Design a protein around this ligand. Structure first.
Ligand code: NI
Length: 341
């Protein structure tokens, strides 16, 4: 059935709850971002109001074929009334089009649902600063102190410097980047830019990217693989067998591949600095695993919550085991006791 943590009290609202059939009592279905664990169940057959950002709304229409009449895009940073309740969408610093939702309940309670987010100090100067939030529905993906990772800017600098050196030493090397969803576009775009190439990809993936309102996008991507020296492929194909295969396809235009796998966290983070990362190599193929995250580190999540000072926290991730639930709850208490709320 629909879990309680997908339901917003005192409203007829749900959040990221599209795989339970008709949810009894639900008058509006909010969608925080276009990732499949969250949109699961949507299709052209859906006949209830969907509320979301403009970008998420472009992907609903084009990729899932949801009917225009049921898509209700809202602008960010703007007080909006939905079925008699004041809401606000905010940038979640996750993938394109990803939002957090502020609900202002008729009774005076204020609820923030983060969706999926990477907490940032810039959030402390949005409309969140203007009033008190009583309840926080929190993206707890990396809610444990072992989860450190570098800034996004540091990771992109590593990737750009690595690719530029490799191709300047060998102008017949190909660069390949993995993808399985929207997000982490800066990886392949920043590498393409430093190399003076467009990024080459399949028709399906090009269509996906053309929904994202990225400025000057026609100048950065293409479906002509032959004219491009940065290729995007399915994350599944980022391994030695899949890469040798792909190299054969290019017809002797290239004699080396340098590939990037943007992972979330991986255990070499607890030991290794970004400056010290190394590839796995077999022959003329090298694969780099780089920790580009679009979720909060443990310290970023902690700072956000200690700034916000909510009265109650409802986790939306890792809720499936008693061990994880009990661990999260202990961090919440530490944080509250250290900060004094
Ligand atoms: Ni997500």
């Amino acid at each position: 059935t629909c879990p309680f943590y997908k339901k917003i009290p005192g409203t007829g609202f749900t959040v990221d709850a599209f795989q339970y059939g008709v949810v009894e009592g639900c008058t509006a279905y909010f969608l925080t971002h276009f990732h499949s664990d969250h949109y699961a169940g949507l299709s052209k057959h859906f006949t209830f109001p969907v509320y979301c950002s403009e970008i998420t709304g472009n992907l609903l229409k084009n990729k899932l074929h949801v009917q225009e009449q049921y898509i209700h895009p809202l602008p960010l940073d703007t007080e909006c009334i939905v079925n008699g309740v004041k809401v606000v969408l905010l940038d979640a610093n996750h993938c394109p089009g990803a939002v957090m939702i502020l609900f202002y309940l008729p009774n005076g309670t204020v609820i923030l649902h983060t969706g999926d987010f990477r907490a940032d100090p810039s959030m402390e100067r949005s409309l969140l600063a203007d009033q008190k939030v009583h309840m926080l529905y929190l993206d707890t993906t990396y809610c444990s102190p072992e989860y450190t990772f570098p800034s996004q800017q540091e990771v992109i600098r590593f990737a750009i410097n690595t690719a530029f050196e490799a191709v300047t030493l060998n102008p017949h090397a190909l660069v390949v980047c993995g993808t399985y969803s929207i997000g982490k576009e800066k990886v392949f775009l920043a590498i393409a830019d430093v190399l003076g190439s467009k990024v080459g990809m399949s028709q399906e993936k090009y269509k996906t990217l053309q929904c994202l309102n990225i400025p000057e996008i026609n100048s950065l991507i293409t479906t002509d693989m032959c004219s491009s020296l940065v290729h995007l492929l399915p994350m599944m194909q980022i391994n030695f067998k899949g890469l040798q295969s792909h190299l054969k396809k290019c017809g002797g235009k290239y004699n080396q591949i340098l590939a990037f796998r943007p992972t979330g966290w991986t255990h070499s983070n607890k030991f290794t600095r970004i400056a010290d990362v190394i590839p796995q190599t077999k022959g003329n193929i090298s694969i780099y695993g780089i920790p580009y995250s679009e979720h909060s580190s443990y310290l970023e999540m902690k700072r956000f919550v200690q700034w916000l000072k909510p009265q109650k926290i409802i986790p939306t991730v890792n809720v499936g085991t008693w061990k994880s639930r009990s661990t999260m709850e202990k961090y919440f208490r530490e944080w509250k006791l250290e900060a004094g709320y």
